[PDB]
Amino acid sequence: AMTPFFWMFEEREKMFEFYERVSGARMHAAYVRPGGVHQDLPLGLMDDIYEFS
Amino acid sequence: VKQDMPPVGGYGPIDYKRNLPRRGLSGYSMFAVGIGALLFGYWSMMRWNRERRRLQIEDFEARIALMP
């Protein structure tokens, strides 16, 4: 089943772009301090998440 | 002033229904299509084989007349 792997990984490439815009890291974004989330989202992210949804 | 990211007056819906059209063609009709094309091929093949039998009889006449 070669191809749906790559379809859904293109969607996951959008999701790693979202992680990048949130923190900066591709995958291993720490970003969650004990004591709540640190350094909140830049203005212009929730509409992108709406589009992805 | 505050410049967070809330939804702008709320957001629209996103469906979660399994879209499968089950098309279809009412497969007994597909049997009718297949048997119809099958019988069409049989009738045309039948006609062409019998005319080639006629012309092969002409080739038999060629070898009969040419021989002595």
Short mmCIF file of C-alpha atoms in Angstrom, two decimals:
data_model
loop_
_atom_site.label_atom_id
_atom_site.label_comp_id
_atom_site.label_asym_id
_atom_site.label_seq_id
_atom_site.Cartn_x
_atom_site.Cartn_y
_atom_site.Cartn_z
CA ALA A 1 0.00 0.00 0.00
CA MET A 2 2.56 2.53 -1.20
CA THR A 3 0.60 5.74 -1.86
CA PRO A 4 -1.74 6.67 1.09
CA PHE A 5 1.40 6.81 3.21
CA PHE A 6 2.50 9.77 1.12
CA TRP A 7 -0.92 11.43 0.93
CA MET A 8 -1.30 11.55 4.69
CA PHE A 9 2.36 12.48 5.13
CA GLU A 10 1.77 15.57 2.99
CA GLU A 11 -0.97 16.43 5.48
CA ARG A 12 1.53 15.76 8.27
CA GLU A 13 3.95 18.14 6.53
CA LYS A 14 1.32 20.81 7.02
CA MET A 15 1.22 19.78 10.67
CA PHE A 16 4.97 20.12 11.08
CA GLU A 17 4.68 23.57 9.51
CA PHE A 18 2.18 24.30 12.29
CA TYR A 19 4.66 23.10 14.95
CA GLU A 20 7.31 25.30 13.32
CA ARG A 21 5.05 28.36 13.47
CA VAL A 22 4.21 27.56 17.10
CA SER A 23 7.70 27.06 18.50
CA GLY A 24 10.31 26.67 15.78
CA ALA A 25 11.24 23.02 16.06
CA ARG A 26 10.20 20.53 13.42
CA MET A 27 9.36 17.59 15.68
CA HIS A 28 10.82 17.73 19.20
CA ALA A 29 9.34 20.99 20.36
CA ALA A 30 9.55 21.01 24.14
CA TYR A 31 7.25 24.02 24.53
CA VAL A 32 5.22 22.69 27.50
CA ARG A 33 6.79 23.81 30.69
CA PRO A 34 5.51 22.47 33.98
CA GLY A 35 3.45 25.46 34.98
CA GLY A 36 1.52 25.76 31.74
CA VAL A 37 2.39 26.40 28.11
CA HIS A 38 5.30 28.79 27.49
CA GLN A 39 5.59 31.45 24.75
CA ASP A 40 2.10 31.34 23.23
CA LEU A 41 1.03 31.23 19.61
CA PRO A 42 1.65 34.06 17.13
CA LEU A 43 -1.32 35.96 15.77
CA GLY A 44 -2.56 34.16 12.68
CA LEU A 45 -2.54 30.47 13.58
CA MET A 46 -6.10 29.50 14.55
CA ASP A 47 -7.46 30.35 11.11
CA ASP A 48 -4.79 28.11 9.59
CA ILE A 49 -5.88 25.31 11.93
CA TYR A 50 -9.46 25.97 10.80
CA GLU A 51 -8.35 25.62 7.16
CA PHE A 52 -6.51 22.38 7.96
CA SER A 53 -9.59 21.05 9.74
CA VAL B 1 -5.74 46.25 24.02
CA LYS B 2 -5.42 42.48 23.58
CA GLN B 3 -4.48 40.60 20.41
CA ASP B 4 -4.84 36.88 21.14
CA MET B 5 -6.21 34.39 18.60
CA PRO B 6 -9.83 33.51 19.32
CA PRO B 7 -12.17 32.29 16.59
CA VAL B 8 -13.56 35.30 14.76
CA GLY B 9 -17.18 35.19 15.91
CA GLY B 10 -17.07 31.40 15.90
CA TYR B 11 -16.23 28.86 13.21
CA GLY B 12 -18.29 26.90 10.72
CA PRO B 13 -18.95 23.18 10.79
CA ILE B 14 -16.86 20.31 9.45
CA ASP B 15 -18.68 17.12 8.52
CA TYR B 16 -17.67 13.64 9.66
CA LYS B 17 -19.89 11.41 7.51
CA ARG B 18 -18.61 8.45 5.49
CA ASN B 19 -19.21 9.39 1.84
CA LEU B 20 -19.50 6.14 -0.13
CA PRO B 21 -21.89 6.33 -3.11
CA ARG B 22 -22.35 2.51 -3.52
CA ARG B 23 -22.41 2.96 -7.31
CA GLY B 24 -23.66 0.63 -8.38
CA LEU B 25 -25.30 0.09 -11.80
CA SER B 26 -27.79 -2.55 -10.45
CA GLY B 27 -25.47 -5.45 -11.23
CA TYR B 28 -28.09 -7.74 -12.76
CA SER B 29 -28.08 -5.11 -15.50
CA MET B 30 -24.30 -5.50 -15.65
CA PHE B 31 -24.81 -9.23 -16.25
CA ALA B 32 -27.21 -8.20 -19.02
CA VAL B 33 -24.52 -5.93 -20.52
CA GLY B 34 -21.85 -8.64 -20.33
CA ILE B 35 -24.02 -11.38 -21.83
CA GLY B 36 -25.17 -8.94 -24.54
CA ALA B 37 -21.62 -8.06 -25.59
CA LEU B 38 -20.68 -11.75 -25.34
CA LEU B 39 -23.51 -12.79 -27.66
CA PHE B 40 -22.71 -9.91 -30.04
CA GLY B 41 -19.17 -11.22 -30.33
CA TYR B 42 -20.46 -14.75 -30.91
CA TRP B 43 -22.80 -13.70 -33.72
CA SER B 44 -20.17 -11.63 -35.53
CA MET B 45 -17.50 -14.32 -35.07
CA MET B 46 -19.96 -16.92 -36.38
CA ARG B 47 -20.63 -14.96 -39.58
CA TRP B 48 -16.94 -14.27 -40.22
CA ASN B 49 -15.87 -17.88 -39.62
CA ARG B 50 -18.44 -19.21 -42.07
CA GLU B 51 -17.40 -16.77 -44.80
CA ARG B 52 -13.76 -17.70 -44.27
CA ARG B 53 -14.86 -21.33 -44.61
CA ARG B 54 -16.30 -20.37 -48.01
CA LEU B 55 -13.01 -18.84 -49.12
CA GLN B 56 -11.04 -21.81 -47.77
CA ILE B 57 -13.26 -24.03 -49.93
CA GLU B 58 -12.09 -21.85 -52.83
CA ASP B 59 -8.49 -22.60 -51.83
CA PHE B 60 -9.36 -26.32 -51.82
CA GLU B 61 -10.64 -25.86 -55.38
CA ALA B 62 -7.34 -24.17 -56.23
CA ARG B 63 -5.29 -27.16 -55.08
CA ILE B 64 -7.70 -29.59 -56.77
CA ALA B 65 -7.66 -27.89 -60.16
CA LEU B 66 -3.97 -26.98 -60.19
CA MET B 67 -2.61 -30.44 -59.42
CA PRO B 68 -2.25 -32.66 -62.56
#
